Design a protein around this ligand. Structure first.
Ligand SMILES: *[C@@H]1O[C@H](CO)[C@@H](O)[C@H](O)[C@H]1NC(C)=O
Ligand SMILES: *[C@@H]1O[C@H](CO)[C@@H](O)[C@H](O)[C@H]1NC(C)=O
Ligand SMILES: *[C@@H]1O[C@H](CO)[C@@H](O)[C@H](O)[C@H]1NC(C)=O
Ligand SMILES: *[C@@H]1O[C@H](CO)[C@@H](O)[C@H](O)[C@H]1NC(C)=O
Ligand SMILES: *[C@@H]1O[C@H](CO)[C@@H](O)[C@H](O)[C@H]1NC(C)=O
Ligand SMILES: *[C@@H]1O[C@H](CO)[C@@H](O)[C@H](O)[C@H]1NC(C)=O
Ligand SMILES: *[C@@H]1O[C@H](CO)[C@@H](O)[C@H](O)[C@H]1NC(C)=O
Ligand SMILES: *[C@@H]1O[C@H](CO)[C@@H](O)[C@H](O)[C@H]1NC(C)=O
Ligand SMILES: *[C@@H]1O[C@H](CO)[C@@H](O)[C@H](O)[C@H]1NC(C)=O
Ligand SMILES: *[C@@H]1O[C@H](CO)[C@@H](O)[C@H](O)[C@H]1NC(C)=O
Ligand SMILES: [Fe+3]
Ligand SMILES: [Fe+3]
Ligand SMILES: [Zn+2]
Ligand SMILES: [Zn+2]
Lengths: 424, 424
């Protein structure tokens, strides 16, 4: 069900060496930097970026770096990544890319300065892919009346690896597909399993290669030593991104980083604490049932302990929401291995239903267990609308519904400022 | 309690550019290849190795490769790794190293050809370190009347990382310390946590660096894409080595490899199936209690399913033995989260009590749970003496005891050829 190559959506911007696949993300820790990334296919081109604010039209230039990679019998075009920095908060910015030959203009708006009661609305999309369904989700999100300002991307980007030799063209199509959204608003990236691409047979054995060349993150802004896990503060939220397919052993770098990072969170500054990951820790569908177990046995307590608000995952092509629940009592022989409501525990939501290759996971465990608050096998996206330091309203729009129909909806009470039972 | 630098044990072989830190390991999948590794400190030197069999004294030469690494303000000497191959089975071999200036002679014996009833005796040492205690273990093993022929090394080699800036000299001392054993009989290597050495502060952030330069394994012989996990067949046993601090997510390379590898095991050819890892899956001591949980939730079933015989780990500086037990029934809400005797499950033994920096873990969970068959906080090593395709006799010598005193002893009944209850 993957949109074919001719698809209008996959069309290449006209012009010799026309910057295609333009896509941006947060470039620093708190909001005043952007990473502009694009691809030129005719010849290398200039990695410079021209930008200026709407108000003070003083045009400035930032210079980036260009790279290329080979996959198997594939060869990338020229990939460029430039980082504009020291932007002013809350400001529309105009940036042009492709200065040497055919220039393309775009705009993005710096977010507000980090704050206790600074509202912001994130869209949640995970497991996008490039089926027609995916097209639909992307448009539903594009139209949600409460308009999203940043997309938290929970993993599995293009499924190019389903194609033979992971036909990296499918990475180029996807890049072009999603441009309409990403060239204007950042998408926070999360490594999914489809990103791994461990292909020994074709002699590709460096995990996350194509992904890593195409998508960059300010991992160094947190003090991560790897792009596969990092964090960003934006508006009022503090976002930690983890890697299910990287390592979390005790003492390993991801483990070491997450621990320290959790201690660096300041709720007085960023009331909302959100965590992202691909494989979900709490899941009641049959598909991938219990994979999150390992990472669960490692990070749950921390999450409960620091009172993280929500945890979004993908990986299960469907939707599900949970009760604020923990299960941190088991000690092997003591039999306390059953999830209990705990109000310090986060609400685990899974939204890997944005489309993939057009297939939904419907087989679920009968009957819906206590921990599971609401679950449905439909394609859709989500929105997490932060209001105050106490309120944030999550929503779930189904692809079947009209753009403004909230198939599911929930008010989040800040685990830190207003810990009242938001459970139902 | 770490033996000081002057220690006779740490002495440098006399001679200009005298090959020091000589140490060998299996170089192929089935036994007819050796990897000779040494270090020259004065100048690069020749990476050639001269070898010949006792019988046919036709001296041959194998050429290796030389490398060096810098750690922080440290700089290795010249490390050499040469692989002699196509050796004859069961044959004493003589090899000389350091041909250009001061040559040193050693010998090793190829093992017997892989077989159903081929006996062999492995020594188990884990968590060695370089305290006086360590010295003692090494000697106890050196004297065990049933003489070991290969040492299965369960992780944590030298604890150089306890020193400041991980003073890599301590890696050089350890290398010299253990030479008396390793230059003559292979030690199968397992990455321990102390091997990770993730030191961002001193700008060292590549996991396992010093370890990886100094110790090499025939990972490519299995079809591993990383030295951190591999397998070797020797005598009658099939040995799988895993990495607790590498990644095991579903789809990750280690995960992918272990699965396939387990399918490649032929019990009709190698009756004994042994698995190595550092962090133990079943552990009743307080120290590191429940760390193996994650990797457990991922590989246990496989082990039960393939009927692996034993699983050795280190990490807990003490000793413990278990009942053939599984705990593969939990499905979250069903409460079946308690270990039961299962005769298809392996016996999990932990021997991280070879010495470390001279400290034993004694705090254990009271009372000793059902799954735990025998546990004690003493320094020691182990021997796993394979007899037939049905019998193998494990033993545990305490450092307090005399060389031939088996503080613990157990007969192993082959999970495949003779699955009778060896439990007690
Ligand atoms: C890559 O190889 C496949 C067959 O192995 C072939 O069909 C395909 O067209 C090739 N692609 C390129 C860009 O050469
Ligand atoms: C591209 O830009 C260069 C320099 O601006 C110019 O000389 C060249 O002719 C342009 N057109 C093409 C097709 O390269
Ligand atoms: C994708 O959706 C856009 C609008 O949402 C539409 O203009 C376009 O034709 C669609 N293309 C496909 C292949 O669905
Ligand atoms: C490439 O193809 C397969 C993958 O394992 C193998 O036969 C071959 O050795 C691989 N590597 C090279 C360098 O050809
Ligand atoms: C939080 O927002 C809700 C509506 O979402 C509102 O009713 C409530 O009074 C707000 N709290 C503050 C402190 O303004
Ligand atoms: C490395 O630095 C430490 C202090 O940072 C110093 O005491 C030590 O002697 C140095 N080692 C070398 C080999 O320079
Ligand atoms: C080492 O060997 C070389 C060549 O065999 C020789 O010329 C040299 O003088 C020897 N001695 C030293 C100290 O290098
Ligand atoms: C280590 O043990 C050996 C024999 O086992 C002995 O000769 C040596 O002196 C000992 N050294 C230390 C520092 O214990
Ligand atoms: C080296 O020391 C610390 C480690 O994080 C840091 O201050 C510095 O930036 C590091 N890197 C370099 C290149 O100095
Ligand atoms: C296995 O070895 C034991 C002693 O360890 C012996 O009693 C038994 O008969 C042997 N089995 C075979 C088939 O020889
Ligand atoms: Fe997916
Ligand atoms: Fe240890
Ligand atoms: Zn997935
Ligand atoms: Zn350890």
């Amino acid at each position: 069900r993957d949109m074919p190559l001719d698809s209008d959506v996959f069309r290449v911007p006209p012009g010799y060496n026309a910057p295609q696949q333009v896509h941006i993300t947060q470039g620093d820790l708190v909001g005043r930097a952007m990473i502009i990334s694009w691809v030129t296919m005719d010849e290398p081109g200039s990695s410079a970026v021209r930008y200026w604010s709407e108000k003070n039209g003083r045009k400035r230039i930032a210079k980036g770096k260009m790279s290329t990679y080979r996959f198997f019998n594939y060869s990338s075009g020229f990939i460029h990544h430039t980082t504009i920095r020291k932007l002013k908060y809350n400001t529309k910015y105009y940036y042009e890319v492709g200065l040497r030959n055919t220039t393309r203009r775009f705009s993005f708006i710096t977010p507000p300065q980090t704050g206790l009661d600074v509202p912001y609305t994130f869209g949640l999309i995970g497991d996008l892919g490039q089926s027609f369904d995916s097209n639909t989700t992307l448009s539903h999100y594009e139209l949600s009346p409460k308009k999203g300002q940043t997309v938290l991307f929970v993993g599995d980007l293009s499924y190019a690896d389903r194609y033979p030799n992971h036909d990296n063209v499918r990475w180029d199509t996807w890049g072009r597909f999603t441009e309409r959204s990403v060239a204007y608003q950042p998408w926070i990236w999360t490594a999914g399993n489809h990103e791994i691409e461990f292909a020994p047979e074709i002699n590709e054995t460096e995990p996350f290669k194509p992904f890593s060349y195409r998508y960059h993150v300010p991992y160094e802004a947190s003090q991560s030593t790897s792009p596969f896990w990092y964090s960003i503060k934006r508006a009022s939220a503090h976002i930690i991104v983890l890697s299910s397919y990287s390592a979390y052993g005790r003492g390993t770098p991801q483990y070491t980083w997450l621990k320290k990072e959790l201690r660096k969170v300041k709720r007085s500054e960023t009331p909302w604490l959100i965590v992202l990951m691909h494989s979900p820790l709490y899941n009641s569908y049959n598909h991938h049932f219990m994979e999150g177990e390992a990472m669960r046995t490692k990070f749950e307590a921390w999450f409960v302990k620091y009172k993280v608000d929500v945890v979004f995952a993908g990986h299960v092509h469907a939707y599900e929401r949970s009760e604020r629940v923990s299960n941190i009592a088991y000690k092997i022989t003591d039999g306390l291995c059953t999830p209990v409501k705990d109000q310090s525990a986060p609400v685990y939501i899974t939204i890997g239903d944005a489309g993939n290759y057009g297939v939904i996971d419907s087989n679920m465990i009968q009957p819906q267990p206590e921990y599971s608050a609401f679950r449905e096998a439909s394609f859709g996206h989500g929105m997490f609308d932060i209001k105050n330091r106490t309120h944030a309203h999550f929503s779930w729009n189904r692809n079947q519904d009209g753009v403004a129909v909230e198939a599911d909806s929930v008010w989040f009470f800040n685990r830190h400022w207003y810990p009242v039972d938001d459970s139902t």
